[model samples]
Structures are given as structure tokens and as C-alpha cells.
Target: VPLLLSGHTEAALREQSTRLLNDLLEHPDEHPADVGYTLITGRAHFGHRAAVIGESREELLDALKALAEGREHHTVVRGDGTAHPDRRVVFVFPGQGSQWPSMARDLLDRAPAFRETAKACDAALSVHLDWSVLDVLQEKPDAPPLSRVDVVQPVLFTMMLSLAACWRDLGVHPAAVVGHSQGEIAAACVAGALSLEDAARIVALRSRAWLTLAGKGGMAAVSLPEARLRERIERFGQRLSVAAVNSPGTAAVAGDVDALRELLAELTAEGIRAKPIPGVDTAGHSAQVDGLKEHLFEVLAPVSPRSSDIPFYSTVTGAPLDTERLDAGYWYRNMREPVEFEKAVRALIADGYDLFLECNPHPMLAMSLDETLTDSGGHGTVMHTLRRQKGSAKDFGMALCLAYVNGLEIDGEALF
Candidate 1:
């Protein structure tokens, strides 16, 4: 039966729930089984503090651990019954454009746990580059900033991997994982499908491969639907393709530099918002990227792929990925193929997932996730691990608070 509690102090309620969650998370001497606790779902300043109900003891305990660990946000496993309830959470790994300079600067010096994971990434990448990942993350004055594709890709891969590590250390985990473009490497690493060593090699090597295409082409985002812009892209001949279908209001076009510029010009004249993705000269996810195939195969020859217990969804295939399918050839095709982010979201929604967590330097794909859910007549929530141009630890804490209120678990020790 449904229940309601009103005519009480909202402040008192919020405080009690917060205390209740903290006690559950601390669990010094009590398991969730021992606590046998239940709380009402309600609105909050950040999001919803939800409850998980109607599941077996084992299921409730498992869900309770995640809720305490902060693995999930705004979701609960039902004992009485449940389908992919609105509480189900998904982790999204962002590709290329989501990175920013000096992204981990503060974290490098301040967040010890973060640096430990980042240090490993730095070592893995230090073998080839003149610059250090630590220095780049710190944005040292004397070195080249992480503007080069080679530098940024591996750095981004490490950044997210380390960020994910931070969350894991805090007891938060994800339900399902999805990746776009280079993000697949990070996703695969987080999903346990690929080792950190292999993922590091792929991200660094693959990003370096794009150097060959520097100045050959570029990409731009158009504030218009892919279908609405397709005819114009076709008019540009085989030189360009609709690169990414982000949402109903936005799409990306990529290919020969001049061709893309011309397309951007045409769209701009039509009163559309067309903007270039700064610093990336190499066009991606189009026929122009096909040249990287052989080089990628040879360089990535040593990687060993494994299947995962957790769901590893693919943007390229728009479905759950098989271990065998995530080979070097697939990573190569990932560059030459359009990112089906919207399609992938549809699949996740159909499968009962509605909460999206973007694990990147900042929020890029979250908006896309929101748009897809809106268009699909589905409801969901979007959140992130960090924010651009903010103190790393502070941003992470804020995110944690948001997730905590929304029904995910958190170690809280990591935050303090």
C-alpha cells in the first residue's frame, strides 16, 4: 500500500534521513541486514532521496550495500518486484570533446588516492612521450599543455579511470557501462574487459595515430537534427559525413577541413549555431578516418580482450558488446564510425535503465542523454563526477552529496 507522511518538519525529515544514511554507510558493527532499515522517497534540494523496496533479503542487502557504497543513484531493487526501475543507473564514458586543459591539476597534488591511480597512468604513458602525465595534469608552465591529440587522449583516459577509481574507493559502483569513441577504451578498462595497461597503450597509441591526419580535416557541431542536416552534408559529396547524432537539437559533421568549413558556413547562414570543437584538427567518425586501420591493427596487436560480468554496451553496435567484438579492428572502426549515442540510450531505456552518470572531466554527453530520454518518452536523471574549472575535490564532494541524497551509497571517508 502507498504511504504518506506530512504535517511534519521537512528540515527534521531531511536531517533524520541524512543521519539514517550516514549510519547505514558507517555500518561499523552492523550490516544492512542487521540494520533492516527503510526510508521514504522524497524530493530534495539536489534530487530525490529514493527507497528500494520489495526484494528478497539477499537482493535488499545487495542493493543496500550499493546504496551505502554509493554505487547507484536514485534507484532501488524491488523485492515485491521490479523491472529496470527508474532507479537503475548507467555510467557513460565521454569521448574527445569532453576534455579540458589542466583537468586534474589540483587533484594531482591534493587527492592522494587520485594521484596513485594517475601515477600508474603517467608511467604507462611516460615510456613514449617527452612530457609527463603528472606534469600535464598539473599544467606546468614550461611544458606543452595537453592540446595535442596524443597527449589529451591518454590523459583523458587516465583522468576518467582515476576518477572512477576515486568513486570505487568510496564504495560507489555502476550498474551498466556505455562508451563513445575513445571513451570505449576507458569504459572497457572500468568494465574489467581490458586491463589498465592495455587500455593505456590503446588510448596513447590510437591518439598518436590521429597525428597523421592533423590538418587533413576537422569537425564541427551543428545545432540542428542529423536528418535535417543530412541533405546538406550529402551536397558536400563524400568529403563529409554526419559524424555524431547527439540529440534532436544537435549533431556533429566531420571530414575534409574545407568541406566541413563550407558546410558550417552554409548552416550558419541559415541561422543555425555552428561551432568548431577547439584544438582538434583531425576529422573523426567518418570515411576520412579509414586510413588509420592498418596502423591501429599493427600497434594494437598485443591486446588481450576478455568478456565482462557487468554489461558493456557499445555505441558502435548500439547493443551490449561481446568480448570478442572489442578487438583492435573495433577500436579502429570506432574512429571511422558515427557515435550512435542516442541509439545506445534507447537500448538502455528499453532494458530498464534511466539514470545516467557521465564519468568525464565535465558534462557533455549528459545533455545528449537527457535529450534522448526526452525524445523516447522516457524519464531519467543525468549526473557527473567532476566539473570544469573547479577544484577537483570540491566538485567531487558536491557530486557525492547529490548522489547520496538520490539514493546511492558513498564511503564519505574519501570525501572528507
Candidate 2:
């Protein structure tokens, strides 16, 4: 018969085992059949001889006594009907201009719940711009453009927030959060460390500040070495600056129209592929935005940071920020700081995390993960992006659930 052991607490089992072993060790003259005991928590069984060794009672007792000594005792149970220990992190992306009208139409048609969310967002913004924003982006309308930075930022934030809510309703949650540029506001909101209204307010302030600073210059995407990119931009001197270092080979340069054209022409002449990120007129990270820092801080100071319910990593610092110190100022500073997204990815990888999930309208973070891992000797990490072409909130939710279950290798037959 199999020996059965049960205990209410791990400590209790260890104590019980210790007592039983000591009893056996002390009464070596007594036969095993004369003793009867049940092992429970903190106790371990080695062999049947301990249970039936009346013929050589002293020898068995000595063996049991030896087994009890110098063994590393642990009160922590490894597997006891709990979730498996798996290292996974989900990075949330905030949709910006990429959120077209046609993108969520299927959800609007099939998932009334999500449609109501989009409508509610429109109401919350106190503008009838939601549907139009989606429509304009989807149709790529020329007459009435959806390219306004102010309009695009909030729309994307709302869409991402709605997507996150939908996913949570399906029982999916993230281990950590990160957003790209404007998406950072939505990331803060979803992380439950920032209030929705406060996030919206800050995002509005940011959009206005950026829009006002737009005419200072424009941003361009170039595939070239950082040194070469910086040298070319320096050739234009104070007129331009390297706005973003997106990846190893790609960098964004932002500056005045004349300066940008000059640098672009120079880089192109050198055989570097260069082009502008459409719909954006301002150089976001350039010195031109430096003037807005104090004003942005003033706008952020009133908002208080709350304790985070989950870990949220900042692309600015490339580390997990303390939730208690998170405030309006932190958000404002993020806007002024260059996003160290590549650093954040590397940090997570170094921490032994191999699974990455991108919760965005597009696969931007997924692509970034691919590039980061590829450059870092291919550490065999898995990346998943929830970009359902024609999927509902349920579909998004199921994808996350399936990803988790598959990642952990849960046995469905056993679970049932």
C-alpha cells in the first residue's frame, strides 16, 4: 500500500517528522510492529523498511535516525495545486495614428460591449471625434485629415485602454507594462497605478504642448550607424538633433524643415535609407521641446501617484519605477526624456525573462523584441502580439489565455 501523508501546514509536518524520527532513534530496542504512526507535513518517507523492520528493529531505527539528520529541511512546497512558476512579461502598446476607423469595426459589429466602450470614450472626451478619428485613419482621408497630434494621441489612448479592459474581462493580466511614446499614458492607466481621468488630462496637456512645439522641426527615420547619423545631423549644427535611437541600425533625426531636408539629403547621398515618419510635424526629443519642460511639470504636479497593483517598467529609465514615486512629474519627465526601449528589453532579458507579449493595436513591440533578441545572440525568447485582424475582445482574451497555458504546458486533461 502507498504511504499517504497530509498536513495543514509545512511546519507542522516537519515537526511531526522530527518527533517520529526521534522516538524511533531513542527506542531502538522496540520493534517496528510495536509502533504505529502517520507522517504528515514537513515529513518525508524513504523506504518501507522503516515501516516494517521488526526483525532488525535497531538497524531500521538507526537507518531512519540517519535519514533524519543533516537533510536540508524546507517548509515551502514545490507543487501543490498552484500555478507553475513561469517568467513572462506583457508589454502594452498604446495605439496612436495607427488606429484606423476600420480596425475595430468588426468588434463594433460583433461585440456590442466594445462598441459601447468606444462610444463611452467619445462621450468622456466631450467630443464627437471618436468615430471620425477612426474613419479618417481607416480611409486615409485627404479632405479632413486625422493627422492632428492632439486628436490622434487621445484616440489611441482610449482605444488601447478599451482593449486592455476587454482583455482583463477575459481574465488576462500583464506581469509588467511599457508603452511607446504616446502609448505611455495608456500604459500607466492599464497598470492601475494611474487614474483614467488623470491619464487623459495629462495626455491632453502633452498633446497640446507637443502640437505647439511642432513647427520647430520634423522627425525622420534613417537606417544608419548612430555615429554616422549624429555626424550628419551635426553637419546641420544647431538646426537639428538625433531625436530617437530606435534600434541598432535605425535612428530618428528631428529638426527644422530646411535642416531636416539638408541632413536627409546628405544621409541619402551617403547611401543610407532615410524617410520621414508621416503625420508628425514636430521633432519630439529635440532641444526645441526643452522649453516646454517647466510648463509640463507645472501641469503634472497636481496629479498624485498611487501605489501600483502591478510592476510597470519605464522606457525612460529602462527599469521598474517605484509606484509610490510615480506622479504627474514622472509622466511629464517621460515626455521630455528619450525612450530607452532597447535598454528596457535588454534589462528584462538579463533578468531571465524569456516570454514577451505585446498588447497593442499593432505588432510594434513584437518587432522591437525580435530585433533586440536578434542582435543579442538570439537568446531563444518567445514573442507574441495580440493584433487580431478581425477579432473581438473575446478573441484577444483567448489568445492571452492560450499563450499562458501553452507557455506553462498545462495539461488540459488533468486540469479538467
Candidate 3:
């Protein structure tokens, strides 16, 4: 956790800063890190927050003094906090496109909770795969590239799960959870609805199923309203299907590469934005996915889901459901049906969930959630845990800073 100084306003923060400086002046031998930890862990976060990141006691004191004096300080970050009496936070798990090379490698050495969770995911995945997930994360010479469907799905799921562990350890817990596409596996596992091994089995087998249809079809993202997209695709008859409603104005279509290419051409000619989702040579959430239904049901027949204390608002049907129903048939439909991301996010907003954190190596759904919330005239904040190719520690530090500025308490003991 990062050190955050907060109060209801700038004046309140100045008062707190003066109080802290007075105490520190008496205890001249106090350590900087310890002082930061005590300030972050032992205080109440309010509507205004300030953060001063440094190593030495003198540096911290100078920064705090600047803040108290309402002067400019390079290390001091002052911003309005998002905390309120009824704020609700939801962990949003994004599907594919959230992975990048060396995504979580930086946190492996610094965060024990992240490392241990990665090891557990690696062990669980080992039962279903021969490759070492740890090696892949560490970018070993012989590890498979992240482009492979079978590898990326399970690997991304493992990485997301580990990041969640890292966040929980830092004392930022979610009140609810939401997931897009295959990300639901990690969300379910993290929510205690599915065991780690069971979720791994599903991710492995389902991604493998997509491999069979590789090169048979494709998917494209279009920046258009759902009604317009449907009407435009109507000419293709049953050749195309809406694969995902990503946001209120963005959607993806899947089926027949030839049709997708033609659709892209037409949309381009019309001055509307359209493009293929990269690294995807096959399509899902379409009729083609029906081909693997029987196999998936058989392979996932043993999965047992349990009730979870954390509510899981599914994108499958766009509402909160009993997690116990996330069984074989449900898994199949999850792949075969269009992703109701917009609907699910709308439902969450209506239910007063105003804070969303995308728990992934990179963010792909944060903007979509924000768009949905804004379109619905709901007040909310969306954050991503990390970024593409950025150092994990740096991005996680940013996450902590954002969470703190937005009113979440950080367990600063973990910072040591």
C-alpha cells in the first residue's frame, strides 16, 4: 500500500499535516517508511487526499511542510477524494486483450501475495497443461507466446487472479465483482464461487475448443449503436452475429471471415469506425461456438460452484444470479451467447455500485464501464490495476494511489 494523507478538505489536510509534523519533530529518529505506514494505515480517509512519495525523513518533512503551507511540492499530490457514505466498489475482470508480454513479472519479486497466488495458479494449471506458467510470466526462453488461444486464456486468467490477490493484500477489497467474456472464470474463482482448479479446467478446455475453429471465422469491433449495427448486419442474414455489446455505442460481431471483411469494408466506406480484434483468428459467442457445446458440457460436467459472499453480476445474462448455477450448461452458454457487458454494467450502476476496478494486466474494459455509467447519468469512477507493458510495481502503485484518492483504505503494513 502507498502512503496517503487525506481529510474532508485542503484546510483539514493542512491541519493534519501540521499535527503530523509536530509529532515527527519531537521524535527526530523516526523512520520515513514507518511514518508513511502509520499515516496510511491508522487514519480515516475523507473527501480530500494528498500523497507524498519519498524515502528520507527530511524529504517527507519538506513535502508535508509544503502541503501545510499551501505551496508547490514536486512529490506532493493533492486531489479531491471520491469517498462517500454509500460508495460501492466492484472489481471488473476483462476478457482477452488484457494480456501483454512481461505483464506481471515486475510484481513477482516484490509482492508475496501476488507471487504465492501465481504459484498456486501455476500449480493448478500444471495439471491441465505441460508448460510452466511461472516461466511464461517470467518470460523464460522456451515459454510459448501469449498469442495462442489455449495459452493466453489460462495464462491471463492466472495473472488476473494473482493481481486480485495482490490488491486484497494491500487492503482494497471489492464489494461486488463483474467479468467480461472468459474473464468470468477468474472473477468466479476470486469470488469463491468456483475452486481454483475447477476454473482452470474450464479455461483450458474452453480455449482449446476455440483452437478447433481457428481460421474458420473472425470478429470485428464496431463503434456504432446496437440498433444500427444490427440493421447493418441484417443484409448478411445468418452469416453474422453480435458477439459482444462492449459499451453503449461499441459492439463486436463474429462469424464468416469473408462477411466480416465485407462488413468492415462497408463500415469504412460509411465513415464509421470498424476494425478486427487483433490476435483473434477465430470467433466466439456465435453459432460456430455451438459446435463445441457437447464436448464442453462433458469436459466441464464435474465443476461445482458454491455460494459467494461477494455478489457476481454476470455479463452472460446481464444480472446478478446464484453462482451455484455457473455449472456445465452455464459455461457453454457463456461461450455461445453474446456478451451483455453494457447491460451488466447498467445493472450494477442502478444498484448503486459507483466504483469499478479492472483487475487485469492491462485495461480493456475500464473505458467501456465508464461510458456505460456516463450514458446512464450515473456518478462513478473506473480504474485499472495495471497497464500494458508498464512495470507492475509502478502500475500497482498508481492503482493504490487512485484507490486512496477515491476513498479506499490501504493496509500500509504490506508496503514494508
Candidate 4:
């Protein structure tokens, strides 16, 4: 049996041990069988990790008591989850553009978890998509171009889920999960709020809306404060809206191509940095999404949501919300609303989530997360699972090693 204590740092870990000890001591007659199991499976492993192994609850309780008070006990075994770094990892999902021509292609052929997950997502997506997502990822002849909104959205959804599966297979699970834009669909599925099929329906049908909006508008990342960005948006009126608050100094604006061009040119003239966001040339999180609200609600009417055991810090609400409320209505808002990623990250940091792993084919929003940490005066580590064109088996193992040495738990077998 295992009774483990974990926290961002040793000081906090010690406090947690004391808290658990107080609870156990207060209810001395309660069962201890579930205590060990709950701590091992239910809790997130942090940087400073320790476990007390014993034959019975009495022995475990005594050892925990001894450990809490900083006393040495024979049964007490302590291991630093990370080496001298205070970290607790959260899996961060980037929305789009992280997908490449052969992102995760190596993993598909080499990693069972990744390959199996791709197959499963393909099965779920086949019901809604005409082309095979698997064949597309395999880059087989005659696969649809990933440039299409319908193709890339579903493919991104699939890859994010597959990467999460790969991480789980390596025994490195997230303490929490968050996403940007459509990436939240995968995050919801990973958080257990939506089944794979339901999530597939969302990514597939939601992209149908995006497909319709394609070429009508575009998005640009502007390097300005929100107030300054919105002040400029007043010139475009209803034609443009803020798509995402990526960081304290960066925001994504979406609107008609004419408005985007004019805005970018004006910003350039003013020496305010701005550029068009690549991939999926549609103005989601703008008024254009409102045009398809009823359509989305009708298409996604059958979506069912459930409770999630893992903490899901929602970019939709910019905070934690009950997963049961993640229905078609909320998803509709998810597409129409600005991504409050900075606020969500602030909430996560406030709640003691420190480390972040960009769980996508490449790191897109990692810098945004870094900027948020910098602005908020928070200390954290941000790591990515794969790099652009570097999704080989060795690349993945290096990621595992990176997480392992940084304090996240990785199965020894997977490391080898």
C-alpha cells in the first residue's frame, strides 16, 4: 500500500503531510485502506514527493505522523519528484497551427498509445468526416489537404488527444488541463467531460461552421494591451472583435480581411507590431460565429457532458467550472467568445498549478504562457512534448526525460 505526500515544494509537501495526518488522527476509527489508494491515484504528484509504505493502516498512519513532524522513520521513503525545482505539471493544449504535414507521424508508427489513439479518434471522426483522419495523418496519397478548416480542426483535435494518450501511457498525467480555442474540445474529452464520439461531433461539426466562414474574414495577433487593442477595434466597429487574450501584451483580433489588412497596416505605421495568424482563415471568436449559433446548437444538440475528476481550468469562463455544464450551449459560446487564456492561467497559478506542458505537435501558446507568468510575477516551467518536424521516438523519450528530471513522475519502464 502507498500513502504519498506531494506539493509544489518541500515546505508545502510537509504541510500537506501534516494536514493528512490531522485528518487521519481526528478520525482514528475510519478505514485506511482507501486512504492509500486515494492518495496514490486521486492526487496529483508534485515536485516534492514522498511515500510511506507499510503493511497496515496503523503502521502507515504512524509513519505519516512521524514524516509530518520531520522525524525519520524506517518505513518512510522520500523521493524528489523533480530535482531542486518546484513544479506541478498541467497539460496545455494549443488551438491550431500546431499541426504539420507529418506531426506525430513517427509516433503513429512507433508509439502504441499514440497509434491506437489515432485509430480510435479516426473511428469516432469517421462518422462525421468524409475523409479518413488517420489516412490524412499518415500523409497517404489522395488525402485531403490539411489547409481546409474542416480537415485541420478535426485533425488537430485527434492529434491533441493522441498526444495526451501517449503521455498517460508514459505514466505522466496532468495535474490540470487547459486549452486555447478549439483545442478546448480535446481538453474536454481528456478531462472526461465528453466522450470521444461527442467530442468528435463537436470538432467535426464546429469546423463545418468554420468552413462556411472561411475566406470571409481572418485573424491577426496584435502586440498591444487589451485596452489599446480594443481601442483600435473601435475603428472597425462590428467587423472585428478580440479573438483571444493570449498574454498581457498580446491579443488576437478577428474580422473581415479588409479590416484585418487595414488594422495591420495601421499598426505597422504606428510601429505597433501585428501580423496575420496562419492556418484556418476564419474569424472565430468574432461576431461571425454568431451567424451560425443556431446551426451549431442544432447540430450539437445531442452532446452529453459528465463530471471530470481532473481539474479543468476553462478558458471559456476564464476559471474552473463544473464540467456538467459543458453542453452544446456552452460550446457555442466557446466558439463565439474570446479566449481568456491569461485569466485562466492566472487562476491556475493562483490555485497552485505551476508547470505546463504544451501537449500538441508543436509549441504555439507556450510563449503566451511564459509571458503570463512573467507579467504576474509567477515562477513556473513550461515544456513541450514535441517540436516542429521532430516527432521521432527519440524526441518523445527526450520529452519524457525532460519531465522526469523536472519533477513530474514518469514510469521507469517508459523512460527506458
Best by TM-score: 3
- Model 1 lDDT tens row, 1-416: 01111112434434544454566456655544333322223322222243443234445445545544545533352111122212556888987776777678877777777789999888987876677887778777786657777877888888888888777786568778898777888888888888777787888788889888877988888888888878778777779988888788878888998888788888789889998877577888878777788888888767788997578888888788785567778788778888877778888999988678888888777767778888988676778888678646656656664455455555533443
Worst 10 residues of 2 by lDDT: 46-55
Tens digit per residue, CA lDDT, model 2, 1-416 = 11122223445434434565577677666533234323312243221111212224444344344433423312111212222234455655633435544556555565444566566655555432333434542344552444677776776776777666655543346677876666777878778777766776777677767778665578787887567787766667767777655567766677788888887787688787988766577777667777888888776557766877777777777787776666766776576666666677676666655566655555554555667777876353443434536354444434443343333321122111
- Least well predicted 10-residue stretch by lDDT in candidate 4: 78-87
Tens digits of per-residue lDDT for model 4 on 271-337?
A: 9989888875889898988889988888888788998879888999999988999999889988999
Off by over 4 Å in 4: 1-86
Model 3 misplacement above 4 A: 18-30, 55-66, 69-81
Error of 1 at 192 (Å): 0.9
Ranking by TM-score: 3, 4, 1, 2
lDDT (CA) for every model shown?
A: 0.71, 0.57, 0.84, 0.83
Overall local distance difference test of candidate 2: 0.57
TM-score of each: 0.79, 0.66, 0.92, 0.80
Query: What C-alpha lDDT, on a 0 to 100 scale, does residue 383 get in candidate 3?
Result: 84
lDDT accuracy of residue 351 in candidate 1 = 91
Model 4: clashing residue pairs? 81-407, 82-407
Query: What global local distance difference test value does model 4 have?
Result: 0.83
Candidate 4's TM-score reads 0.80
Q: Which pairs, if any, clash in model 3?
A: none
